[PDB]
Amino acid sequence: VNSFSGYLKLTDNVYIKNADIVEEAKKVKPTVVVNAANVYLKHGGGVAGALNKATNNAMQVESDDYIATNGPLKVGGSCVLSGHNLAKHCLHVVGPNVNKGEDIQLLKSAYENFNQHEVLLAPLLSAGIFGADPIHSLRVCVDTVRTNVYLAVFDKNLYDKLVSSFLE
Numbered sequence: 001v002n003s004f005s006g007y008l009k010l011t012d013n014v015y016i017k018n019a020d021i022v023e024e025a026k027k028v029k030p031t032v033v034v035n036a037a038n039v040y041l042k043h044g045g046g047v048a049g050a051l052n053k054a055t056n057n058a059m060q061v062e063s064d065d066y067i068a069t070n071g072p073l074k075v076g077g078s079c080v081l082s083g084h085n086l087a088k089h090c091l092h093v094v095g096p097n098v099n100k101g102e103d104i105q106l107l108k109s110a111y112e113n114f115n116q117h118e119v120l121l122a123p124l125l126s127a128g129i130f131g132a133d134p135i136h137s138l139r140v141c142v143d144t145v146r147t148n149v150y151l152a153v154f155d156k157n158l159y160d161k162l163v164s165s166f167l168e
């Protein structure tokens with residue numbers, strides 16, 4: 001169960017690995033995988049598109065049905081849906097998209113959703129094309145998450161910069 005391997009322990013509850021979250025989910029079979037979602041759960045590209053493709057679009061159909069009944073999420077919010085073949089559950093979390101003018105302060109609310117789950121496999125929220133400074137996102141994660149989080153960051157260059165930043 002939750003067979004995470006090759007992670008570097010940063011704090012007593014935050015671990016990090018240079019890895020593709022999709023490959024990690026297939027191997028580890030975590031209780032929860034976090035999706036870096038948008039408010040309409042449209043998994044069009046990046047991490048969300050990669051996780052949806054790994055479910056052969058089952059995540060997208062389920063997401064459309066959730067939105068029809070419940071309406072969109074708020075920025076900083078989340079919902080729990082099926083993990084499909086990747087996990088028992090997927091926690092869809094909306095971090096702020098700084099490139100589209102959303103407030104970076106909502107990154108704390110986004111990470112706070114992780115605290116309702118004992119163990120999670122997750123990406124670095126609001127990084128990549130969402131525009132947040134990835135060293136800042138790691139600092140918010142470490143300061144906010146209290147449950148056990150395994151971060152998969154699919155870029156060795158960024159991984160090395162994040163670990164060097166944490167260890168200063």
Ligand SMILES: CC(C)[C@H](Nc1ncnc2[nH]c(C(=O)N[C@@H]3CCN(C)C3)cc12)c1ccc2c(c1)S(=O)(=O)CCC2
Nearest residue numbers: 020021022036046047050124127128129130152154155
């Ligand atoms: C910073 C970046 C390295 C990181 N990327 C990732 N981090 C962790 N696991 C990842 N898998 C893939 C991928 O494409 N998986 C594919 C499956 C099959 N393919 C071989 C490859 C990307 C990726 C990341 C972190 C957060 C966010 C983004 C990107 S974003 O999608 O630009 C906007 C939402 C927030």
